[PDB]
Structures are given as structure tokens and as C-alpha cells.
Amino acid sequence: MDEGMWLMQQLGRKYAQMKERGLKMKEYDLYNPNGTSLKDAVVLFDGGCTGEVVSDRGLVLTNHHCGYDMIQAHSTLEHNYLENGFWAMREADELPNKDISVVFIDKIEDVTDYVKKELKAIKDPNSMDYLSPKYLQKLADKKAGKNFSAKNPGLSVEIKAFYGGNLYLMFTKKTYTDVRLVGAPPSSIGKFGADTDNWIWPRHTGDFSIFRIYADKNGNPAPYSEDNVPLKPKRFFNISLGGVQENDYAMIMGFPGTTHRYFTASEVDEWKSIDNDIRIRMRDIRQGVMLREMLADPQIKIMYSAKYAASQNAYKRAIGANWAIKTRGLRQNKQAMQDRLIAWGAKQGTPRYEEAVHEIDATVAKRADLRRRYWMIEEGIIRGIEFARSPIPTEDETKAKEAIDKIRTRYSKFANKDYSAEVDKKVAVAMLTEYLKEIPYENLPLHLRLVKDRFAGDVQAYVDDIFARSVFGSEAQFDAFAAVPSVEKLAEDPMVLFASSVFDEYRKLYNELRPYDDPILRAQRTYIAGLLEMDGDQDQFPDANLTLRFTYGQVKGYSPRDNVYYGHQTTLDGVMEKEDPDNWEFVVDPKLKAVYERKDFGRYADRSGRMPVAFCATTHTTGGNSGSPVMNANGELIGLNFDRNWEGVGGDIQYLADYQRSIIVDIRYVLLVIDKVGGCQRLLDEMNIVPAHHH
């Protein structure tokens, strides 16, 4: 019954409990380590989301916000798929995507003994190779052996460390890079309530999009080619129209990215006071400027919609995280846990665990000045100011027609279709003003002294001068440079001198801070080993690390405070209750309203006649679980995970059963939107849809 993000290896230890919670699948149909199972219909989507195959022709469902980058990339003012959605009426109209991927997890093996055998043979206990991806890849290649990817094309092998270095798993991955956009609702559906409803339950967002994996004519990975055909997969999800009742069993497979459940108390403090607080203040500044520019110009809106969402999501998550830390006493919970271990170890007669907790505390305390400076510049400038990534002429290039083409190339990517120099200047002035007020002069990147030195505090004039006099300040000014390129012109260029100075400081802080990482990491291995020994590993699971996990629970609402209860299911009536045509966040598509007003629900309505939108469950998910398949007790698809409730944000530090809920779009609502809003009948014909007993 236990909550958590369980390794696939732990399905055996949990299977009986899952049956007592309501599971009806046979175990090896869910996950089979030596054969085909439902696991083979799950994919890691574009390196940061989850998705699932739902057709014998390779159809993939994920979230709308998982497909957001590709929806935006294909959008223009002529065809604004962000605004009005997209629906390919035949496979030939499905849109290819550059630099996209879908990864299947073909096999998973425990290689802890092998990895520990290889490590001890190096005879270097202080080396950090036990965490190094480059070293673990060397160990992975050694096991897989003899040009593994060349022999098996599109297949690769990866080893990853778990439990701070106490467990190692090898993953055999099959990667497809021809993944085409098939359908997406308008953002008024897929992102209903936008930032206001982000991380909020009740939720009324139809957060889905639709892709299709293309392969060679044998089903093997192949680069984008109009000759590729839809993948016929080993396995795909049946879609259930049986709905969900309160207390129903529900389970999820997906790729949770990061948790911090083995944080010491002092690490929780650092995370809140440095990482989260700096992110909160810097990004609210960047976002306020950006949004005002976005709402005033429809093309600025297209160009920055994805940039704004990526900034906005982790900003609000940081607010929720610090709120959980404050109001749920998460710092004191970790204090108790590390004190429990310290007391146990004292009994056993070893101080290794008390030393490890003190070692973390001392390192955390020592790196606080630099880490604060690292996060101020990372959130304020590297993330916040786009022309910090303007081209810097390499040493090779300045000591030289052929080079002016490589610099044109980097000016191209910098000032691409998404880049507004006017928006960036408004952002930069607001960001540097907060930056200059929080970082003292003697600690600024060198070029930033000129605000005090040369510009008498005028931040606007400083940024204005960078664009005015720079080779990269405008397309016209770059052409004038590409015509008669100087080197005494570029070597004093204000934007180049800005980008190089802030990146100089960024790396100086990193190189200074990176040594402090190692004592914490080694102490973490000891701290986690002591907790595994003290309490056993039957009810513990390793922190998420972007690998496949499963979690189960019940469909159930929660109560956020006294006399207030939120139920387990929202309806299309809640969308209409929230409609506000004067609020960009809460506009409703007239096609959706007409369907609601006419009750044109088809077989997608609940048996009651009401139209579901979303439900929530006691599963334990985090960032990376977006688009994860949500299965009923028969393994049939009933929804797509897409968020957590506000209190659930604290689940990355501690799960609390009264408050942790995954927010899940009801699969019947996905189908209603495909059918009645998108009008794309062909996608439901290729799905295998299981009727309800009462149909």
C-alpha cells in the first residue's frame, strides 16, 4: 500500500500489497523483466516528460505542456497552433520535429555488485567516479561490449547511481528521434487557468497532446525521413471508458526527475533560503516584464510563450515548496530523522553517521556566500538575460571570411525567430537593477562595474549603450560588421564584453563551488547507507533520478484546511464556472462551450450524464511524471498525470497522506476533445477503446 516512487525491481515486493489495494493485473503483465509487458508501452518523452503508446500505429499521448515547445515551434500568426490547436486529418499532415526523442526502457538490470567490483579495483576511495556519468558509461560499455550501439542500432546502454551511490542499475534504452505532432487542443483547454491554476486542485485543465513515433519499415529507430512508417509497438495501452469512482485503485508508471527525501535539516534550509528564494525573486521580475510585453503584441506572445512557461513553472513550484517547508515543519522532520540515525549509530558503536551529518552541515555553511552568488548570477543573468548568450568571438577567430561565417552562425542562433531585442532590454534593465542591488561592486562581473563607474547608476543607459554600439545590437549593425570586419572593433564590443564577463564570473563561481560538492556527496552515500541499514529497504525507495518508477494509491480528494473539502473529480461545469473573457488565463473555446451547452458528450460522459475533466489520486509523483499513464486495476488507461496539488509540492521532501495528490486529466475528457473539438475521428478509430459495462 506504501506510498513512493518504487523501482521496477520492487514490483515483486509490493505486488501483494497492490492487490490488497485493488490491483487485478497479473504482475508480469504490468512489468516483466525478461519479456513484453505494459512497461513497454511507456516512453520517456523528449528527455523530460513521460508518454504512452496507445495504438498499433505508434500513437503517443503526453501532456499539452509536454508538447508545448513543439506546438510553439510550429506556430505562426497565420497558423497559431498555440491558440487554436492543431489536428492532422491524415498521417501525412503530422508535423516532424527537430531534436526530439522518445525512449523505451527495453531492459533493467541491477549491476551493483559489478559496479562495486570495478570501483574497488581502481583502488581510489576518494575518487568521485562512482557518480561520474562518463565513468559509469565506460562501465556500461564494458558490460554491453564491443560497439554495442553499432551492432544494435538505435539501442544504447546507461548505468545510473541510486541511493547516493549504494545501488546501480543498467538500462537498455531504445531511442526514436522521428516523433511527429499529431494533435493538440487549443491552449484554452490544454492550459486552462494558466499560471493561476498551476499547482492547484481543483483543476479544470485538459492537459494533453498527441504524437506518433515513426520508424523504419522494420520498426527500428531511424532519423526523420518521409520514408519512415508509423511504429508498430510491442504493446500499447487500452483506453477505458469505465471512468473512476472515489477510492478506486490507481497506478502510474513514469520518469520522476528529482526528489530530496534524504535531505539533512541544514540542506532543507539551504534549499529554501538560497536556491528557492533567489529563484522566486529573480523570476517574478523577469516574468512581470515578459508578460506585459506578451499581452501587448501577438507575435511577442508566440515568440516567448515557451520561454515564459519554462520560467513560470519552476518559479511557482519554488513558492509552493517553501510554503510546505514552512507550514508542514519539514525542516524539523529531517532533524528528527538524522537524530534517529545518530542515536542508532551511537548504539552500534560507530560515529560514521554522526560525522556524515556534521560534514554536510559544515560544507553547507561554508559554501553559502558563493552559492548565493552562484544562484544570483544563474537566475538573474544566465537564465534571465538572453543577450548574455550573444556570440563571443573565439581566440581562434579573432586571430584571423571563413571565421565571419561561424560568427554569423552564432549571431543567427542568438537572434533567432524567438528573440526580441526590445523585450530583452526591458528584461535586462529590470534584472540587472535587482542584481546590482544585491551583489556588491567588488563582487560584480567586471563589465557590470560600468553602471557605477561610467553611467552614474543609470541602468537603462548602460543596457541602451550595449545595444547601440554593439556588432550584435541589431541585424543592421551586424551586417555593417560582417562587411568590413575589424578585430579592434569586436575586441571592445560592449555586448561581447558583457557576455564574456558574466560567463567568466559564472564559471569562476562554479569552479570554486564544485569542490564543496564532493564532501557532501560522499557524506550522502554514508548517510543514506545508515538509513537503509537502520530501517531496512523494504519500505524505502531511492530519490528520483529520471529513471522508470511506479507508484500506486487511490482516487481520492483531500481537505486543505478546516471545514473545506476538495472532492476527487472535477467536471466541465467547473470550466464554465471559471470562464472570464477579460482574463487571458480563463477564456473558453466556443467549440467547447457549444459541446457543454448541448450536452454533446457521446459515450465520454460519466454514466450520471455529467462530463468529467480531471481527477486526483494519492500516488506519489514529481517533475518528470508529466504525461505518465494512469491505469485502473486492469491496467487500462484512465487518465494522464499532469500536476500536483499545492500541498503536494512538498512531496519532494516528504509525502503526507492527507495532502499529496497527483492531478490527472480524465481520459474520457481527452477523447471528448479529440472527437468533438478537434474532429479527428481517425485517432479514436486506431485506439482500442474499452466500453463501459453499461454501454
PDB file of all heavy atoms in Angstrom, residues 3 23 41 187 191 338 349 353 372 402 505 517 523 525 566 647 661, unseen atoms left out:
ATOM      1  N   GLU A   3       3.127   4.382  -0.028  1.00  0.00           N
ATOM      2  CA  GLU A   3       3.384   5.472  -0.953  1.00  0.00           C
ATOM      3  C   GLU A   3       4.854   5.479  -1.361  1.00  0.00           C
ATOM      4  O   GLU A   3       5.735   5.151  -0.562  1.00  0.00           O
ATOM      5  CB  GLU A   3       3.024   6.795  -0.281  1.00  0.00           C
ATOM      6  CG  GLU A   3       3.706   6.985   1.086  1.00  0.00           C
ATOM      7  CD  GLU A   3       2.943   6.352   2.251  1.00  0.00           C
ATOM      8  OE1 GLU A   3       2.056   5.501   2.012  1.00  0.00           O
ATOM      9  OE2 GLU A   3       3.242   6.700   3.414  1.00  0.00           O
ATOM     10  N   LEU A  23      -5.524  -3.916  -7.049  1.00  0.00           N
ATOM     11  CA  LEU A  23      -4.930  -4.318  -8.320  1.00  0.00           C
ATOM     12  C   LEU A  23      -5.474  -5.670  -8.772  1.00  0.00           C
ATOM     13  O   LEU A  23      -5.619  -6.600  -7.973  1.00  0.00           O
ATOM     14  CB  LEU A  23      -3.403  -4.385  -8.199  1.00  0.00           C
ATOM     15  CG  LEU A  23      -2.638  -4.880  -9.431  1.00  0.00           C
ATOM     16  CD1 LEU A  23      -2.995  -4.045 -10.657  1.00  0.00           C
ATOM     17  CD2 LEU A  23      -1.132  -4.873  -9.184  1.00  0.00           C
ATOM     18  N   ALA A  41       4.967  -0.063 -23.209  1.00  0.00           N
ATOM     19  CA  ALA A  41       4.180   1.000 -23.813  1.00  0.00           C
ATOM     20  C   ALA A  41       4.476   2.363 -23.202  1.00  0.00           C
ATOM     21  O   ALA A  41       3.880   3.354 -23.625  1.00  0.00           O
ATOM     22  CB  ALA A  41       2.685   0.689 -23.691  1.00  0.00           C
ATOM     23  N   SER A 187      -4.851  26.103 -26.387  1.00  0.00           N
ATOM     24  CA  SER A 187      -4.288  26.326 -25.057  1.00  0.00           C
ATOM     25  C   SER A 187      -5.364  26.673 -24.032  1.00  0.00           C
ATOM     26  O   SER A 187      -5.170  26.450 -22.831  1.00  0.00           O
ATOM     27  CB  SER A 187      -3.239  27.442 -25.088  1.00  0.00           C
ATOM     28  OG  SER A 187      -2.109  27.090 -25.878  1.00  0.00           O
ATOM     29  N   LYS A 191      -4.153  24.425 -21.435  1.00  0.00           N
ATOM     30  CA  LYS A 191      -3.543  25.246 -20.396  1.00  0.00           C
ATOM     31  C   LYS A 191      -4.583  26.126 -19.708  1.00  0.00           C
ATOM     32  O   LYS A 191      -4.285  27.261 -19.323  1.00  0.00           O
ATOM     33  CB  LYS A 191      -2.410  26.102 -20.966  1.00  0.00           C
ATOM     34  CG  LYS A 191      -1.358  26.479 -19.936  1.00  0.00           C
ATOM     35  CD  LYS A 191      -0.200  27.267 -20.525  1.00  0.00           C
ATOM     36  CE  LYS A 191       0.840  27.556 -19.444  1.00  0.00           C
ATOM     37  NZ  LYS A 191       2.008  28.327 -19.950  1.00  0.00           N
ATOM     38  N   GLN A 338      17.586  12.506  11.109  1.00  0.00           N
ATOM     39  CA  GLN A 338      19.034  12.397  11.245  1.00  0.00           C
ATOM     40  C   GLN A 338      19.440  12.184  12.697  1.00  0.00           C
ATOM     41  O   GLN A 338      20.445  11.519  12.964  1.00  0.00           O
ATOM     42  CB  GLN A 338      19.729  13.626  10.647  1.00  0.00           C
ATOM     43  CG  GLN A 338      19.661  14.911  11.460  1.00  0.00           C
ATOM     44  CD  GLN A 338      19.893  16.144  10.595  1.00  0.00           C
ATOM     45  OE1 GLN A 338      19.399  16.225   9.469  1.00  0.00           O
ATOM     46  NE2 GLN A 338      20.659  17.099  11.111  1.00  0.00           N
ATOM     47  N   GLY A 349      27.905   1.622  18.010  1.00  0.00           N
ATOM     48  CA  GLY A 349      29.296   1.904  18.293  1.00  0.00           C
ATOM     49  C   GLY A 349      30.078   2.522  17.159  1.00  0.00           C
ATOM     50  O   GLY A 349      31.313   2.508  17.202  1.00  0.00           O
ATOM     51  N   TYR A 353      27.918   7.951  11.034  1.00  0.00           N
ATOM     52  CA  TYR A 353      26.686   8.604  10.610  1.00  0.00           C
ATOM     53  C   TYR A 353      26.540   9.982  11.241  1.00  0.00           C
ATOM     54  O   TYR A 353      26.041  10.911  10.596  1.00  0.00           O
ATOM     55  CB  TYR A 353      25.490   7.709  10.939  1.00  0.00           C
ATOM     56  CG  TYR A 353      25.676   6.301  10.418  1.00  0.00           C
ATOM     57  CD1 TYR A 353      25.637   5.208  11.270  1.00  0.00           C
ATOM     58  CD2 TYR A 353      25.911   6.071   9.067  1.00  0.00           C
ATOM     59  CE1 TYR A 353      25.821   3.925  10.790  1.00  0.00           C
ATOM     60  CE2 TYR A 353      26.097   4.795   8.580  1.00  0.00           C
ATOM     61  CZ  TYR A 353      26.048   3.727   9.443  1.00  0.00           C
ATOM     62  OH  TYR A 353      26.231   2.454   8.961  1.00  0.00           O
ATOM     63  N   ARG A 372      25.180  31.542  -2.861  1.00  0.00           N
ATOM     64  CA  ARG A 372      24.266  32.660  -3.045  1.00  0.00           C
ATOM     65  C   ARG A 372      24.669  33.501  -4.251  1.00  0.00           C
ATOM     66  O   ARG A 372      23.813  33.935  -5.029  1.00  0.00           O
ATOM     67  CB  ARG A 372      24.212  33.518  -1.782  1.00  0.00           C
ATOM     68  CG  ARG A 372      23.198  34.641  -1.883  1.00  0.00           C
ATOM     69  CD  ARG A 372      23.345  35.657  -0.767  1.00  0.00           C
ATOM     70  NE  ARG A 372      23.004  37.008  -1.214  1.00  0.00           N
ATOM     71  CZ  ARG A 372      21.763  37.437  -1.425  1.00  0.00           C
ATOM     72  NH1 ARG A 372      20.730  36.625  -1.233  1.00  0.00           N
ATOM     73  NH2 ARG A 372      21.549  38.684  -1.828  1.00  0.00           N
ATOM     74  N   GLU A 402      36.082  33.058 -43.572  1.00  0.00           N
ATOM     75  CA  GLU A 402      35.580  31.793 -43.046  1.00  0.00           C
ATOM     76  C   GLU A 402      35.162  31.939 -41.588  1.00  0.00           C
ATOM     77  O   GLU A 402      34.181  31.327 -41.150  1.00  0.00           O
ATOM     78  CB  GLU A 402      36.641  30.703 -43.201  1.00  0.00           C
ATOM     79  N   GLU A 505      32.426  35.112 -14.614  1.00  0.00           N
ATOM     80  CA  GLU A 505      32.047  35.014 -13.209  1.00  0.00           C
ATOM     81  C   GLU A 505      31.263  33.737 -12.933  1.00  0.00           C
ATOM     82  O   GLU A 505      31.488  33.073 -11.913  1.00  0.00           O
ATOM     83  CB  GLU A 505      31.226  36.241 -12.807  1.00  0.00           C
ATOM     84  CG  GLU A 505      30.662  36.190 -11.400  1.00  0.00           C
ATOM     85  CD  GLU A 505      31.726  36.360 -10.334  1.00  0.00           C
ATOM     86  OE1 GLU A 505      32.876  36.695 -10.687  1.00  0.00           O
ATOM     87  OE2 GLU A 505      31.408  36.165  -9.141  1.00  0.00           O
ATOM     88  N   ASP A 517      31.059  20.277  -3.494  1.00  0.00           N
ATOM     89  CA  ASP A 517      30.074  19.244  -3.791  1.00  0.00           C
ATOM     90  C   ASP A 517      30.533  17.876  -3.311  1.00  0.00           C
ATOM     91  O   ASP A 517      29.709  17.065  -2.869  1.00  0.00           O
ATOM     92  CB  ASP A 517      29.797  19.193  -5.295  1.00  0.00           C
ATOM     93  CG  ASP A 517      28.935  20.344  -5.775  1.00  0.00           C
ATOM     94  OD1 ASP A 517      28.120  20.858  -4.982  1.00  0.00           O
ATOM     95  OD2 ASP A 517      29.066  20.728  -6.955  1.00  0.00           O
ATOM     96  N   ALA A 523      29.396  12.143   2.002  1.00  0.00           N
ATOM     97  CA  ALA A 523      28.616  12.024   3.227  1.00  0.00           C
ATOM     98  C   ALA A 523      27.211  11.515   2.933  1.00  0.00           C
ATOM     99  O   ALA A 523      26.653  10.728   3.706  1.00  0.00           O
ATOM    100  CB  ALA A 523      28.555  13.370   3.946  1.00  0.00           C
ATOM    101  N   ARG A 525      26.329   9.414   0.641  1.00  0.00           N
ATOM    102  CA  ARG A 525      26.407   7.965   0.485  1.00  0.00           C
ATOM    103  C   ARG A 525      26.399   7.265   1.837  1.00  0.00           C
ATOM    104  O   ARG A 525      25.736   6.236   2.008  1.00  0.00           O
ATOM    105  CB  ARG A 525      27.658   7.582  -0.307  1.00  0.00           C
ATOM    106  CG  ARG A 525      27.966   6.091  -0.285  1.00  0.00           C
ATOM    107  CD  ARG A 525      29.029   5.707  -1.310  1.00  0.00           C
ATOM    108  NE  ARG A 525      30.298   6.392  -1.081  1.00  0.00           N
ATOM    109  CZ  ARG A 525      31.351   6.301  -1.889  1.00  0.00           C
ATOM    110  NH1 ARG A 525      31.291   5.552  -2.985  1.00  0.00           N
ATOM    111  NH2 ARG A 525      32.469   6.956  -1.604  1.00  0.00           N
ATOM    112  N   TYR A 566     -12.022  19.201  -0.849  1.00  0.00           N
ATOM    113  CA  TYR A 566     -11.981  19.116  -2.304  1.00  0.00           C
ATOM    114  C   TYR A 566     -12.205  17.666  -2.711  1.00  0.00           C
ATOM    115  O   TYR A 566     -11.471  16.777  -2.268  1.00  0.00           O
ATOM    116  CB  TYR A 566     -10.640  19.600  -2.853  1.00  0.00           C
ATOM    117  CG  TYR A 566     -10.287  21.040  -2.548  1.00  0.00           C
ATOM    118  CD1 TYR A 566      -8.960  21.434  -2.446  1.00  0.00           C
ATOM    119  CD2 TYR A 566     -11.273  22.004  -2.378  1.00  0.00           C
ATOM    120  CE1 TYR A 566      -8.618  22.744  -2.183  1.00  0.00           C
ATOM    121  CE2 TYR A 566     -10.939  23.326  -2.108  1.00  0.00           C
ATOM    122  CZ  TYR A 566      -9.607  23.685  -2.011  1.00  0.00           C
ATOM    123  OH  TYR A 566      -9.255  24.990  -1.742  1.00  0.00           O
ATOM    124  N   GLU A 647      -0.257  21.614  -1.896  1.00  0.00           N
ATOM    125  CA  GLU A 647       0.420  20.935  -0.794  1.00  0.00           C
ATOM    126  C   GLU A 647       1.311  19.803  -1.291  1.00  0.00           C
ATOM    127  O   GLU A 647       2.309  19.464  -0.641  1.00  0.00           O
ATOM    128  CB  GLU A 647      -0.617  20.405   0.198  1.00  0.00           C
ATOM    129  CG  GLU A 647      -1.429  21.497   0.889  1.00  0.00           C
ATOM    130  CD  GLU A 647      -2.647  21.932   0.085  1.00  0.00           C
ATOM    131  OE1 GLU A 647      -2.791  21.493  -1.077  1.00  0.00           O
ATOM    132  OE2 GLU A 647      -3.459  22.721   0.616  1.00  0.00           O
ATOM    133  N   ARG A 661      -1.401  14.724  -3.667  1.00  0.00           N
ATOM    134  CA  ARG A 661      -2.277  14.257  -4.734  1.00  0.00           C
ATOM    135  C   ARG A 661      -1.624  14.542  -6.076  1.00  0.00           C
ATOM    136  O   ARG A 661      -1.097  15.637  -6.295  1.00  0.00           O
ATOM    137  CB  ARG A 661      -3.656  14.925  -4.669  1.00  0.00           C
ATOM    138  CG  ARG A 661      -4.428  14.684  -3.372  1.00  0.00           C
ATOM    139  CD  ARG A 661      -4.785  13.212  -3.183  1.00  0.00           C
ATOM    140  NE  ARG A 661      -5.651  12.999  -2.026  1.00  0.00           N
ATOM    141  CZ  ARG A 661      -5.209  12.855  -0.778  1.00  0.00           C
ATOM    142  NH1 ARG A 661      -3.909  12.908  -0.523  1.00  0.00           N
ATOM    143  NH2 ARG A 661      -6.065  12.667   0.219  1.00  0.00           N
TER     144      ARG A 661
END
